[PDB]
């Protein structure tokens, strides 16, 4: 239930719920929300972030053809396994990536320092360049729900992907 | 609610040590208690068996079987099925006595109960507590043993096997 955060309210089913209903409605078996009401906002933000990153990770994994990328060092042909890249370009590319990610993440601290007192909607960083979010609240919430659902799927997806490879030829 | 009165409380102060709040109502507690007892009784026998076998003792016709979990993996399944059959039968036979502590099978067809062992109520509580406590210990013990067997091959950590002193048995 949280505090009205869009989420749950899903026909999505689940027969492995050890405790509680098998539906995905108000999925909080552990019950972290009620025990720690003050952390709901933080949890939402973290959920969104993890999911969004995961959504990018999957496509990053699905492009191991070195496509659109030149350079012998980056050659996916040279580094057949997309997984090997982390250690393959650790001191040549991974560091660079870190620089920008780090700079961007640090600038958000101002908002996250006092989320409860500030009014920003958790996860809303005002990013709609194409200005295309259903204006209608009814659908707006629906859109948000899609993001969460897809993102949650992605989180789980990545795990299987990667691990799978850890157990296959790729 | 307050299950401090129940047998097996950690101590007078802590009362019922339920860190994760598994138990909520008497109904749940009874469920959990029954399970604890069953696992306990089973474990107590298990430790005894593991030690006997690991030390070297074997029944007639079982002198070439291996010991430990290795046995389950190597010994023929056909000679293991008997165990299930002799256990399933017991599963059916044991009959819980209504309106009694979880795990009381006095209502079973064959004579079962405190019999001559207990007289006063206090005696009964003591025996019950001891059964539970010894089971709790064995539960940890059997695990400890199996884990260490896998880790190093020494199921007893400080020695390879026990040596028994049975004068009359000789």
């Amino acid at each position: 239930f949280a505090n009205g955060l869009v989420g749950g309210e899903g026909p999505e089913p689940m027969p492995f719920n050890l405790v509680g209903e098998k539906n995905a409605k108000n999925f909080d078996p552990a019950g972290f929300s009620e025990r720690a009401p003050e952390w709901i906002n933080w949890f939402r933000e973290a959920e969104l972030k993890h999911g969004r990153q995961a959504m990018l990770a999957v496509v990053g994994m699905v492009v191991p053809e070195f496509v659109r990328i030149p350079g012998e060092a980056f050659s996916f042909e040279a580094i057949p396994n997309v997984l090997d890249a982390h250690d393959a370009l650790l001191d040549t590319s991974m560091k660079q990536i870190l620089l920008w990610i780090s700079l961007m993440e640090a600038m958000s601290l101002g908002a996250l320092s006092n989320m409860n007192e500030f009014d920003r909607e958790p996860g809303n960083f005002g990013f709609d360049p194409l200005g295309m979010m259903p204006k209608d609240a009814a659908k707006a919430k629906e859109m948000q729900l899609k993001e969460l659902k897809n993102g949650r799927l992605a989180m789980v997806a990545i795990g299987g992907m990667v691990h799978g490879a850890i157990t296959t030829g790729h | 609610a307050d299950f401090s009165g129940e047998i097996g409380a950690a101590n007078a102060e802590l009362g019922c040590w339920d860190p994760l709040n598994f138990c909520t109502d008497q109904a749940s507690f009874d469920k959990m208690r029954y399970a604890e007892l069953k696992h306990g009784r089973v474990a107590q026998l298990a430790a005894w068996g593991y030690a006997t076998t690991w030390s070297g003792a074997r029944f007639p016709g079982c002198e070439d079987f291996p010991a430990g979990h290795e046995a389950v993996l190597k010994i023929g399944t056909e000679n293991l099925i008997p165990v299930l059959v002799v256990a399933g039968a017991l599963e059916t036979l044991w009959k819980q006595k209504e309106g009694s502590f979880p795990g009381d099978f006095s209502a079973t067809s064959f004579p079962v109960g405190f019999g001559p062992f207990a007289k006063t109520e206090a005696d009964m509580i003591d025996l019950r507590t001891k059964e539970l406590n010894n089971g709790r210990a064995a539960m940890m013990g059997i695990l400890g043993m199996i884990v260490h067997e896998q880790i190093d091959g020494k199921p007893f950590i400080f020695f390879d096997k026990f040596e028994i002193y049975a004068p009359f048995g000789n």
Binding site: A30, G31, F32, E34, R35, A36, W39 | E13, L14, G15
Partner: protein
């Protein structure tokens, strides 16, 4: 209610910290056990940290400095008689502690009985107590980190500030 009275342990960086809400329904006695455990685990960690650091540094002037500089190897090299004394001695202190706990007015964690002279009304007292807790919390994590480094990474020295 413990939550409504506790003052020590709640500091600035995060305030009250119970993301998993492991103390929502606990009674005063359980909460007291938790605080005592927290302090004890932390204090022991702080000590262990200092011990490891000294040994790793090489300042182990005992047994003619025969034992290894690696703290984990040294423990194996120590005779059992040494270990037995350690456990038994600590056990003795544990017994005395139990006596103190039983005495009325026991404040979880206080073995010196500072309650006799000072109360939590004094801000200086609460602050200093907070420092012990905070450093202990950090030490707990550190000792766990160092062991990983020594057992898996393979080093038992600072890999953070060593590079001047």
């Amino acid at each position: 209610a413990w939550r409504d009275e506790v003052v020590v342990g709640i500091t600035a960086p995060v305030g009250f910290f119970d993301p998993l809400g492991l103390s929502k329904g606990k009674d005063d006695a359980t909460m007291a056990y938790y605080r005592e455990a927290e302090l004890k685990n932390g204090r022991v960690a702080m000590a262990a940290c200092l011990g490891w650091y000294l040994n790793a540094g090489g300042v182990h002037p005992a047994f003619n400095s025969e034992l290894s500089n690696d703290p984990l190897k040294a423990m194996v090299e120590l005779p059992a008689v040494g270990w037995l004394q350690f456990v038994l001695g600590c056990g003795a202190i544990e017994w005395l502690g139990q006596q103190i706990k039983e005495r009325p007015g026991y404040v979880p964690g206080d073995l010196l009985g500072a309650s006799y002279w000072v109360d939590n009304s004094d801000e200086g007292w609460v602050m200093y107590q907070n420092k012990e807790l905070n450093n202990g919390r950090l030490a707990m994590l550190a000792i766990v980190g160092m062991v990983y480094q020594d057992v898996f990474v393979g080093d038992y020295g600072d890999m953070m500030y060593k590079q001047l």
